[PDB]
Symmetry: D2
Subunit: 428 residues, 4 copies
């Protein structure tokens, strides 16, 4: 097929969005001005499996502008924004995705990107193992023609590692997930901004003066706490890792166990990425009308089945907002049914944060492709100098003035004027 969007008529609407986003995504735009001549991806036939949204569309066109031939599929049945896919389809790009697909239409869409006008894909841009998987299990003949892979998710990267272990990984991968520019944004900065958006949009609740308990103090936890803290709330953190617990303490946050914190919190945010964070025994302790939500792993953190199964009432107050009544007579306001509150009750992360994650994708794609034999099969990390590069693509928009190391300082520090500035073990 030429492509498949829900309403190509929505294409004019999307472009308008794409163009506003471009301003907030200076990364992908610098890639365009830096390479839309050298056309570095000239030759690449990139199959991409990634949520078809405005930001992703801006990514796609950056790939296309750098000389890449591209076919796209959304890695989530609902994540795709139709006016954005409409614009791409209209742009003459083979996009197969609409909001509200079936598992059937989903697998179909992905398969629809494997074959180009002059041969099958020779590159992969994945979010969530799916694309690398489908080809690995149901189309292994293609593997040899694929020069590389770029993966930007925890899941996908664990898989590339598992697959590697089992010797299934046939094509070299580049883990963009752990880039400091991708992680700090996708995790810390994104959640810091979008968390309170979900809460306010869903409840319009005053945050100042409330006690907010945050399970987990990893990047997402650090951002969620900082955010709440700046609003006027008393953040209590819970942790299993002594190093992360120490960091919380050093910053002035109380750190206890949920078994205790549940009796004190007014808002509860989970960040763990692990099961059984908030249980029935916790709900029974909570104050009347506590707001409970999650921004870590899709629904495995809060025990919603208990709420559904033990509450005396449940009344949907609005989309993504339920308020249960317990036998103790206390209500509990649950957000997005335990799913992600920022994507579920708000719009998820700002374009600027996507600019960092997606610019990481472009950086991987250009490197793998332009580097035929330097990367062995297996999941490798994005070379730091490239990581430094995506950071540098955003200064400017931020009106930051990087100072240049002089030849004398360079030699003194024993580092190139623009080569990597920190060793591979440097935690920033």
């Amino acid at each position: 097929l030429p492509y498949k969007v829900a309403d190509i008529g929505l294409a004019a609407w999307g472009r308008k969005a794409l163009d506003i986003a471009e301003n907030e995504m200076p990364g992908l735009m610098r890639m365009r001005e830096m390479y839309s001549a050298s056309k570095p991806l000239k030759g690449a036939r990139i199959a991409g499996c990634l949520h078809m949204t405005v930001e992703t569309a801006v990514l796609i066109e950056t790939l296309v502008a750098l000389g890449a031939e591209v076919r796209w599929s959304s890695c989530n049945i609902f994540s795709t924004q139709d006016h954005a896919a409409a614009a791409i389809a209209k742009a003459g790009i083979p996009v197969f995705a609409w909001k509200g697909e079936t598992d059937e239409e989903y697998l179909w869409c992905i398969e629809q990107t494997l074959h180009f006008k002059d041969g099958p894909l020779n590159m992969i841009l994945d979010d969530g193992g799916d694309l690398t998987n489908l080809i690995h299990t149901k189309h292994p003949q293609l593997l040899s023609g694929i020069r590389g892979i770029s993966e930007e998710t925890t899941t996908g990267v664990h898989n590339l590692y598992k697959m590697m272990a089992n010797g299934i990984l046939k094509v070299p991968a580049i883990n963009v997930n752990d880039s400091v520019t991708k992680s700090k944004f996708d995790n810390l900065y994104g959640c810091r901004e979008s968390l309170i958006d979900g809460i306010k949009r869903a409840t319009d609740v005053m945050i100042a003066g409330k006690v907010a308990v945050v399970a987990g103090y990893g990047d997402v936890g650090k951002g969620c706490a900082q955010a709440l803290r700046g609003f006027g709330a008393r953040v209590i953190i819970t942790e299993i890792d002594p190093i992360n617990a120490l960091q919380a303490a050093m910053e002035g946050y109380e750190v206890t166990t949920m078994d205790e914190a549940c009796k004190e919190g007014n808002i509860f945010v989970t960040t763990t990425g692990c099961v059984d964070i908030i249980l029935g025994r916790h709900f029974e302790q909570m104050k009347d009308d506590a707001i409970v939500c999650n921004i870590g792993h899709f629904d495995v953190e809060i025990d919603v089945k208990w709420l559904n199964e033990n509450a005396v009432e449940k009344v949907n107050i609005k989309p993504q907002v339920d308020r249960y009544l317990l036998k103790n007579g206390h209500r509990i306001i649950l957000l997005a049914e335990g799913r992600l509150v920022n994507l579920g009750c708000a719009m998820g992360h700002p374009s600027f944060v996507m600019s960092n994650s997606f610019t990481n994708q472009v950086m991987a794609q250009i490197e793998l492709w332009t580097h035929p034999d330097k990367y062995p099969v297996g999941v490798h990390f994005l070379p730091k100098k490239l990581d430094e590069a995506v950071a540098e693509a955003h200064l400017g928009k931020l009106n930051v003035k990087l100072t240049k190391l002089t030849e004398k300082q360079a030699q003194y520090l024993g580092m190139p004027i623009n080569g990597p500035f920190k060793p591979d073990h440097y935690r920033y």
Copy 2:
């Protein structure tokens, strides 16, 4: 007529809204558990003129629950939430209000609240001066029958002082507007919570890393500055008063003139309450896609007409979000048409802030009513013990444990154990 609501069908739904807001309006709830049995307002016939909302309905039932007789109407033609009005009328309270009234129906609505079964109104609860102006200008027969006035707005209060200056004021008034609990929650705390919600709902923009220029550093300016700062923006302040300016400087904020700041910021917030804050000469200097919103005085602060008259294009991006292309090639994203961004792009202030302003009002009603021979015709401030009292009604929900001064300490401090704890010139 017994009432006049756009639709009494939303009543059952209005109640739903009310029973949820009550939880965030502990001020109104303590007033009840504290005076509903005793009925201090027993005998008062209160005419109220104040935006008919969920939060205001909670207030009304509090006044009613204290032995008051009440007739109500809005103080703005649109402000009135119909399901809230419907439930008030459904409860048997005479409310003459609906969203979208014609200027003609508004006056009529006020007229209805002036007479009760047992007689005319003997108490005014105003927000704006409308009721008090109407009663004076068009109903002076009633003046000698009204025991007291209760006002909570700057416009309304200025009006009172002006009438009194002209010797036209004939009934004592209490200015609840300048109570620390009214002012702090309405100006400082309210806008701190909501400013960013407006900007995000309208633009979904990343705040961190942006230079935000806030004009003014009064209560609104302080809250707006603090908010943006907690998000990661580099706030720059502008001011005319050396003291407020010094306060900003002492907190780490740069303080300049708009004439210089315009060349730098990405987000502009007005908090002044004065005219001609952002003129075209400034717009011509702004960076591409600067966001310019106002949260101070409705429309006077930004030169919107200039935008309208000098932009090459103008496109509505979504309700309350407009984007102008200027002759220099830059785009100016203007929010709420230069009107209050919190009210125009968000949902205004949280119930909790309302709980402070309204408890201040219940307080004023109770006191004026209960001390007929206490207040000379004039516009007085709320006794500090009452201001502290409204503050205390909220401790508790805040999980605050207030300590009680012993008799020795009270004696050492020379203040009553419960009596006011600060002199009238105490700025908190």
Copy 3:
């Protein structure tokens, strides 16, 4: 006598300090550039009772530089810095003060400033009742020749008020203590900077990760909390006033009672200005080696007698640092023996803050003297425009750019381009 310093030889050492301070005290220096021509105090014969320190010395010379004839005495037997008094004495100014005087030498010193070469004092600049008192009870003949008084302490002002009440106040006063520029600095900004200085210098203790309980949340408590909070500690506040308790809560601080907080705090700071804040019953609860100190009222806040009388051991670890051993086997580190920790274990407030407090003194002196009959007997507040003036004397050093109201905005706001910008009830 010509004067009386401990060691005039120390006079060269002083001038060196005076000159460095001048830089951080832009206020008194702008007074000099604005008035060392008009010589507004020409004629005044100012007797001054203020701690003879370097800052005060910079003050004195400003007075002298503005045409004033001056005689000085220190309002505290130990507060006087000899190299500073030495420079003044050397400069040809009658200063009678040395660190470590007797109550006898103290009263003597004060009397030594009542008479000038050409008659007795005609002005008074006091800090702590003393000067106004001595003349009022032991030299009432002088009262008539005294044109005005400037008082800048809570004590002194309560007294001016009490005296006024009793009809004893013969000469008009101006309370500089409550100026927003004097108060915010003397209380908020000063203590915020100096508190941790005392604790660190005395203990060299890590602040981050500790629970710090602050009694009181007025200006001093706000500053102390903010200070600790920025170092990484978890500040718990205790209050008797509901309004101040609300402010703490709204800022994210837990607010309890000392009865509870004593069991949790690692550092304790009292800000109250009231007796019995920390008692024996609290020490018995405290964690091992808690650091307890005070920065409010001299010694009445912490129960030191209990510590002395119940501890099993006490060992002075260094000047202003005692460590008690309780019967429970827990130690308690006490600072400056319950006296002010910033003055006692550090250097008190920075010059820039004294600049604000003292410039208020110069302001009052110039106003009273220059305004022969506009001030009736009684303690008056420093007119706002003068308060705005001292604020503006410091912008510039701070490199702040005040923006000027245009004639159009001025009229719109109904205020002068430079006249007072806020009403008398404005709490900043």
Copy 4:
């Protein structure tokens, strides 16, 4: 000789110091209560070369309490606190150290720690490389007798890598310098606490309202910026690395070049660790009385010679505080002669930060010693479970309640309940 301390008379006083520091060094205290009975270091003959301080003494007694045989010396000629040295010697531990040693006595002091009654050293605990270099260059006979090396400095560690690169390293080493708990407390947290202390002790200057320019934004830069920020200064960052620079921008800090910042700041802090940060061309642009200090690399960051060779005057205001008059009329206040302000003008890092660096050392010692056939000749990192372990030894004093992962969650997360909790590439 059994030891060699400048004076063993301070012993009883040293102990006093030690018994106080112990409370703030829970890491060392837990190792004892955890391993003193079991004596894991039983048999080890540890030669240690580390600044002989109170904090270091606590460490020594810990290694001792764990069954280790120890001989010690400093790793700097001045660093060694004599009363601390005296107490260790007084307890029967062979310490060869005193403050103010000649370069010649230093080498000798080291030599002493090389031989024990039962034989030569079989373990190295080094701070700087000296011991390890001396053993290699001057005592290779001993090499095959030493089981392992423990190093905690950048210099020392770079040395290990270099020797290992030249194939000279003959004994395995563990780099405790790059453990998160060592780095975070030494670079980030330590400096955060002490930087401002240095500036205050040296200048007693008001920080709020000043523009502070921090050169660099690594761990030291981060803590220094955060510190100054909490005081009310407007921090401006300078950086060569795009990522760190983005990090600063994402927090609100302006990022420019020193070439521009010099014209604006009032306080200047270097954190770079690189040469030529503040040159004469910058000095000539600074405002009057700017403060310029260094907290990074000893003396290389600021061009002091320039000051010395181009200032018209130069005056020592107090130890470690010098002030230069430049030909342009401005004065430059330089602290610690361009050396580490925290150590030169304050008391260095708090015991608690040292408690982290040293528990890291006890850890490495215990591990290498207890795993003879585990480490290949080379410089390794501290196993993450040990790093998490030193972190946990401090939770507790911090009033932190670490939660334990259930077997289910453990299995869901795919990590041991106690085992490491993050991959090696995890940047906290």
